[PDB]
Design an enzyme around this catalytic site. Structure first.
Site, mmCIF file in Angstrom:
data_model
loop_
_atom_site.group_PDB
_atom_site.id
_atom_site.type_symbol
_atom_site.label_atom_id
_atom_site.label_comp_id
_atom_site.label_asym_id
_atom_site.label_seq_id
_atom_site.Cartn_x
_atom_site.Cartn_y
_atom_site.Cartn_z
ATOM 1 N N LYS A 1 0.816 -1.211 0.000
ATOM 2 C CA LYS A 1 0.000 0.000 0.000
ATOM 3 C C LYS A 1 0.851 1.262 0.000
ATOM 4 O O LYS A 1 0.417 2.305 -0.506
ATOM 5 C CB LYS A 1 -0.934 -0.003 1.213
ATOM 6 N N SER B 1 -1.965 13.649 28.263
ATOM 7 C CA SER B 1 -1.293 14.542 27.347
ATOM 8 C C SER B 1 -1.052 15.881 27.991
ATOM 9 O O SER B 1 -0.155 16.577 27.540
ATOM 10 C CB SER B 1 -2.119 14.705 26.060
ATOM 11 O OG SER B 1 -3.262 15.495 26.347
#
Ligand SMILES: [Cl-]
Ligand code: NA
EC number: 2.7.7.7
Length: 307
Positions: free
Chosen positions: A63, A168
């Site tokens: 791909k 985060s």
DNA sequence: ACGCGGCA
DNA sequence: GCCGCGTA
């Protein structure tokens, strides 16, 4: 900087499609390759160097060599028509792929359909009620206010408590999807009891709006800062004994991909890593640095774990 | 690992 | 009591 945005764009599409379709590990495999593509020092330009990167074998090397030679991905045309509705439904907190396939095969196609005819667990009704708020990230300064809210409510019960927002937020991102507040006490003792009282205190002040999971040492819920104009936010509160603080920090700081790789590394060294401990028998780990030491790894600042 | 909730 | 699901 990602030198291979030419293809990772196309591949997150397929990755997300497999994900909402419940092909957990196909998607995992793709997510892992994407991360390799993002970080490889240069753009990839041959099949030999495709398979070179760990995480890309036959099916994936193609791909890449298709997009490069064709500028497109064939399988993206052969992507089931249901996928966007599956994503919609599993964006509801508390509803996963199996629940979203059910509602699909029951004939549901819209969120109004879910509010109308679908049967919902308590968590899914909370999730759907806050659907838009929960897809919106908050600036980290709002996360700070959420941390400080929890910290002050807690420190009134005991001043010595450590309270640290992880996720985060701790990795330095300017926006945060949710907030996890980790609490311990250095005296090894005083972390006991206050969990119940603190959630009440926060419930009593209108800060906690909705409870999702009430564990013994871990709470998942919904909060909202004082006053008007504000959004409901996902908040987790975790209480840990001091000896687990380092592994708890490391786990709830993540990222999730970083946690997975660390667990894998620990496995290849006869060990296992949880939010609780680094184990074989628990190996003491007073700080995050020590966990890194034992796995034979250079320390990595939270901002460097943002995998 | 573990709460949640179905089990008519 | 069990076990699938969902999230962490
Ligand atoms: Cl969500
Ligand atoms: Na979901």
């Amino acid at each position: 900087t990602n030198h291979n945005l030419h293809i990772t764009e196309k591949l997150e599409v397929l990755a997300k499609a497999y994900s909402v379709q419940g092909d957990k590990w196909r998607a995992l495999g793709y997510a892992k390759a994407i991360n390799a593509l993002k970080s490889f020092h240069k753009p990839v330009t041959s099949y030999q160097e495709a398979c070179s990167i760990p995480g890309i074998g036959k099916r994936m090397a193609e791909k890449i060599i298709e997009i490069l030679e064709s500028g497109h991905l064939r399988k993206l045309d052969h992507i089931s028509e249901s996928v966007p509705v599956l994503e919609l439904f599993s964006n509801i907190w508390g509803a996963g792929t199996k629940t979203a396939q059910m509602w699909y095969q029951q004939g549901f196609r819209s969120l109004e359909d879910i509010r109308s005819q679908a049967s919902l667990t308590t968590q899914q009704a909370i999730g759907l009620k806050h659907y838009s708020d929960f897809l919106e990230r908050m600036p980290r300064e709002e996360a700070t206010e959420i941390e400080q809210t929890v910290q002050k409510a807690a420190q009134a019960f005991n001043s010595g408590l450590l309270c640290v927002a992880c996720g985060s937020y701790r990795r330095g991102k300017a926006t945060c999807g949710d907030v996890d507040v980790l609490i311990t006490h250095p005296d090894g003792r005083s972390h006991r009891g206050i969990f119940s009282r603190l959630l009440d205190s926060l419930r009593q002040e209108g800060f906690l709006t909705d409870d999702l999971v009430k564990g013994e040492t871990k709470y998942l819920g919904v909060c909202r800062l004082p006053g008007p104009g504000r959004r409901h936010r996902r908040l987790d509160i975790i209480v840990v004994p001091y000896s687990e603080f380092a592994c708890a920090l490391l786990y709830f700081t993540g990222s999730a991909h970083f946690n997975r790789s660390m667990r894998a590394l620990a496995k290849t060294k006869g060990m296992s890593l949880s939010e609780h401990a680094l184990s074989t028998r628990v190996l003491p780990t007073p700080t995050e640095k020590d966990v890194f030491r034992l796995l034979g790894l250079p320390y990595r600042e939270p901002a460097e774990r943002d995998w």
